């Protein structure tokens, strides 16, 4: 049993943390998890806030919300965990339909798997095997555009930004185009075509993540842009795959963003939300071309095992949350976050070391001038009622979905004094 | 809601396994539901029909599913606290976990990186060691060297460290010694020394499974080895990583298979066992000095979302706890035994070429391919859940599994043995 200062003196001494250097920097202690608050112990005392970050992407539905958790304990009274080799269950298959019906088009296999950066390497297996297949060793490379994330795996690492992971000779070498505009220049599209034209026949695959950029910089671009990488790809057959990680299960303000321009690739990653923050859970999604390619080319498999592969404890909560989602009128909320983020946020454009306001769906984000002190941030926030997470230059929320209206604006008051704090 | 036939026909269409395709069969995988003690409940006649698990859904659950302990610390957690971002925040299962695993682990591996899952914590671990070397300005040092027989997962780093011939070339060139062979042989290591040397001032890391080659051919190998590695580590200045995502938490009878060779690791893996079976969770631990190292190149670019998951953690605290408030090194030795005992007959039977016995890891390997569409259909009808891979009928019961039990799962294995 530990105190708070016992997990401090734990924690220091014997874990690592995202981006961390064992002595150096200062994490805070988190007590509980409630709907869309966190209890922070600070100053030996317990402190309400907003999960303004959704841990991280993930709590859609905020914590210890009554379905999800009844999805879980109910699921663990019949069958906590079985291997996926040569059995199969419930919730792999319900969770499948589930996916394959509310996905893009044509996306109707998947591959189950635990992390993100996994999820990713598979959709690149998948690639590879396919061309393979196809009489096409040759292609095997992938292109992307820069500022571009998708997990800290060395083959994920090396489709995340180049000159901004992080730059490593170590990890393979893409094809990286320039940074894609915010708003839908025609000629873009045409210089990439360009590239891709030179690199075709090497080319396996395309990766992206669809209008929204997350962790490469909260970025955002034309939902236009995508339906130009669609058939460029479809005009050079190359695959194009979207990573959907960060994007997926109404976070921009549409289901998946892929359907901002109703495109569906050839191949789809999700994860984050999947389990609607609960568990580690990621899908890998190919259109049955894809697999009938795999299955019937040489070694006619998809060499990939996860040990925890379709877990069931990690469906069903996903089966909760994702049918969570579609019963509710999703849409019209996600609207009234943006609306409310927006009115909340407007303030900060008229601040000196504000560079952008910009929100998408649940997507609240203040671009400054500065790199973010998170020394000065984190309090203030944290002074606030608000837990907060800058990142290089950006002041950003992307709160869960059932945040009240007052709760969106604690969130959006406090990034603003945040930004002002320079 | 969903009978077993609508799951089979979702799956059939909708569905990848492992290593598995879609649209070929040519064995239809049996549906689960439910699954508890050692015992999975499964579907095949259309009917209801219990089995011994066996193995343990993959090394996962070896205390057993629901077990009340385990399944009452997911319950608790759950009620006040399901995730946080470790990013700028810590929390008490975490802490809890790090103690537990750095005190238990061979001595010197003194700090946690947790991750989702068992290859994420081998690409960790070799980013520890690449990280580790720039550190020290010798950024030459960045290939792998490791054994023939191995697997470390199935993300292309982890790829490129696996026994080249199962488990297309665009992988990372790594340096693969020959296979490690059974019984202790001074002139292996030597020759493994040798060549280690001539590409060592380009080698970052070696990397192996202590004792048990997992799912490279289920081969166990003689524990010096390892402090033989551990000193050709020391020398050449390599440094040395273990696998123990299979062998971890007693599975091969000491608590870690390197305690066996009674030598510490500079990087070191675990995971599959750690959860007590119930969620994917992986950690890699690293020593003060790997720690240190890294910090002044400038800090470990590694962060999972779902790093130091609250209810992973939760859980795996009451496995690990389970573990060792009671005398598992008996309870293993008796599943060895047991076990040895229960597989005797088959070396006698023709197609049976070895029989081999490491803690609770039983092995009939064989002559020939066993085609599982007889296999798979013939263990079920003795009541046991049995997955053998090309030539090897093996186990890796619970270790709840009771001297009963084990004859029932080991008389299983010996029949689809003499089935060829
Ligand atoms: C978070 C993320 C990943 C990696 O996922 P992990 O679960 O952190 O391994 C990959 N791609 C995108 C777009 C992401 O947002
Ligand atoms: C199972 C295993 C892994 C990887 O496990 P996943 O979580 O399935 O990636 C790595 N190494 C060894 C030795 C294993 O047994
Ligand atoms: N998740 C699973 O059921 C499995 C993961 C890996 C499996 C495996 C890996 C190698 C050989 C035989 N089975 S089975």
């Given at each position: 049993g530990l105190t708070p200062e016992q997990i401090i003196a734990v924690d220091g001494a014997h874990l690592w943390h995202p981006y961390?250097?064992?002595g150096r920097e200062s994490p805070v202690v988190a007590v509980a998890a409630h709907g869309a608050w966190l209890t922070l112990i600070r100053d030996g005392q317990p402190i309400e806030v907003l999960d303004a970050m959704s841990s991280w992407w993930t709590a859609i539905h905020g914590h210890g919300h009554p379905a999800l958790d009844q999805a879980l304990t109910t699921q663990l009274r019949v069958m906590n965990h079985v291997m996926f080799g040569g059995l199969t269950h419930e919730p792999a298959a319900r969770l499948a339909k589930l996916l394959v019906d509310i996905?893009?088009?044509?996306?109707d296999t998947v591959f189950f798997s635990d992390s993100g950066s996994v999820s990713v390497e598979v959709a690149a297996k998948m690639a590879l095997q396919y061309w393979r297949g196809r009489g096409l060793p040759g292609k095997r490379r992938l292109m992307t555009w820069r500022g571009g994330y998708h997990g800290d795996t060395f083959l994920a690492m090396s489709i995340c930004?180049?000159?901004?992971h992080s730059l490593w000779d170590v990890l393979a070498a893409q094809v990286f185009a320039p940074q894609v505009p915010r708003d839908y220049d025609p000629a873009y599209s045409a210089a990439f075509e360009a590239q891709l034209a030179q690199h075709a026949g090497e080319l396996a695959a395309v990766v992206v993540e669809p209008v929204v950029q997350g962790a490469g910089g909260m970025r955002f671009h034309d939902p236009r842009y995508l339906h130009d990488l669609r058939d460029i790809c479809r005009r050079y057959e190359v695959l194009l795959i979207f990573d959907?990680?960060?994007?997926?299960?109404?976070?921009?303000?549409?289901?998946?963003?892929?359907?901002?321009?109703?495109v569906s690739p050839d191949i789809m990653c999700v994860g984050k939300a999947l389990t609607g923050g609960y568990l580690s859970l990621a899908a890998t999604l190919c259109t049955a071309d894809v697999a009938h390619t795999i299955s019937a080319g040489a070694a006619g498999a998809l060499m990939h095992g996860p040990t925890?592969?379709?877990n069931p404890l990690a469906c069903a909560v996903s089966v909760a949350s994702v049918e969570l989602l579609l019963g509710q009128d999703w849409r019209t909320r996600i609207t009234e976050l943006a609306a409310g983020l927006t009115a909340g946020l407007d303030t900060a454009r008229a601040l000196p070391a504000v560079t952008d306001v910009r929100v998408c769906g649940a997507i609240g984000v203040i671009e400054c001038d500065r790199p973010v002190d998170l020394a000065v941030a984190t309090p203030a926030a944290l002074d606030r009622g608000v837990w907060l997470r800058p990142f290089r230059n950006l002041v950003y929320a992307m709160p869960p979905?059932?945040?009240t209206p007052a709760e969106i604006t604690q969130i959006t008051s406090a990034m603003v004094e945040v930004a002002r704090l320079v």
């Open positions: 961390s250097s064992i996905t893009p088009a044509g996306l930004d180049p000159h901004g959907e990680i960060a994007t997926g299960f109404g976070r921009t303000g549409a289901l998946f963003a892929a359907d901002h321009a109703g925890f592969m379709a979905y059932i945040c």
